[PDB]
């Protein structure tokens, strides 16, 4: 009510008009007036403990290892940045598109070759996070990505 | 077979014109014409025009015999009102509503 564009004038006198008493037309009881306890700009972030973060990341990867859904790759032989090359490599690797895949690798040419596929989520090793792991059905990582994961959950 | 005619947005109060319409409901066309000619009301002028328009529709458009026509249905619906200011004493402003009517006449065959 203090931020709407209306003036503070009392619209009609307090007594003897036969109407309800009112102040200014910015009051929330008026149509077009101010809003009571509406939203204001807000910060929703908070500091989750680091140990809980590291424990969560290790559990999420262990969950994929439970089901046999984690695969490690030494190198992507024929993948050099063309989408049809990744598809050929994925077919011989057993990834035919029936399940969603989180692909973690520092190889930029591999990440851009798989990016446009609707069932692939691409991540650099520095970006490994539990929301992306839980979202997808399969986890595919490089050995270089694996080493960064080991260092992170040290 | 039915012949209908509607006059919409006639600037007359529906209550006043409804008194005239009730006089001709169910009558034959010849009796309805005579009644409306000698009814001393403003509304009878408007009702007669709708009745004659409906009679023309029956013969011209719907292959109905004029000698067998009778008023099967007739009613007045209220239209949008015109709101006007009427000044009163001591600076008070009143609102006058100038109402409008939709007049329907439906003819059948006896």
């Amino acid at each position: 009510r203090g931020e709407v564009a209306y003036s503070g004038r009392k619209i009609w006198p307090q007594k003897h008009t036969g109407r309800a008493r009112h102040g200014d037309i910015g009051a929330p009881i008026f149509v077009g007036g101010g809003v009571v306890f509406g939203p204001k700009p807000r910060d929703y972030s908070y500091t989750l403990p680091k140990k809980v973060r590291k424990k969560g990341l290790a559990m999420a990867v262990a969950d994929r290892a439970r089901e046999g859904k984690l695969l490690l790759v030494e190198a992507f032989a024929g993948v050099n940045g063309k989408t049809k090359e990744f598809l050929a490599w994925a077919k011989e690797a057993g990834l035919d598109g029936s399940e969603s895949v989180l692909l973690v690798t520092g190889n930029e040419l591999v990440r851009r070759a798989a990016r446009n596929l609707p069932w692939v989520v691409t991540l650099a090793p520095e970006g490994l996070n539990v929301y992306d792991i839980v979202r997808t059905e399969r986890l595919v990582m490089d050995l270089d990505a694996w080493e960064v994961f080991q260092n992170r959950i040290g | 077979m039915e012949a209908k005619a509607i006059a919409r947005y006639v600037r007359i109060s529906p209550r006043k014109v409804r008194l005239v319409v009730d006089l001709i409901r169910g009558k034959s066309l010849e009796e309805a014409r005579n009644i409306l000619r000698y009814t001393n009301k403003r509304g009878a002028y408007f009702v007669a025009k709708v009745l004659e328009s409906a009679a023309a529709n029956a013969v011209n458009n719907h292959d109905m015999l004029e000698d067998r026509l009778y008023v099967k249905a007739a009613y007045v619906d209220e239209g949008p009102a015109l709101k006007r200011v009427l000044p009163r004493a001591r600076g008070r402003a009143d609102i006058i509503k100038k109402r409008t009517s939709h007049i329907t006449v439906i003819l059948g065959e006896k």
Binding site: - | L19, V20, D22, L23, N34, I35, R37, Y38, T39, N40, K41
Partner: protein
């Protein structure tokens, strides 16, 4: 005086009962003996101008 006002809104049934005497009566009409047109009795015929068996006004 001290400005009397209605105490309650009139109900739909009560106001329509008050209008139970409002219906119009149709005009009295008789045929004209000369031209057989319907007209009120005891008036000069507006169609042919005859009254009491003689021509009265020009039409």
């Amino acid at each position: 005086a001290k400005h009397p006002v209605p105490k309650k809104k009139t109900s739909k049934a009560r106001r329509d009962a008050r209008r139970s005497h409002h219906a119009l009566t149709p005009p009295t009409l008789v045929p004209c003996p000369e031209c057989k047109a319907m007209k009120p009795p005891h008036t000069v015929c507006p169609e042919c101008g005859y009254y009491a068996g003689r021509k009265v006004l020009e039409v």
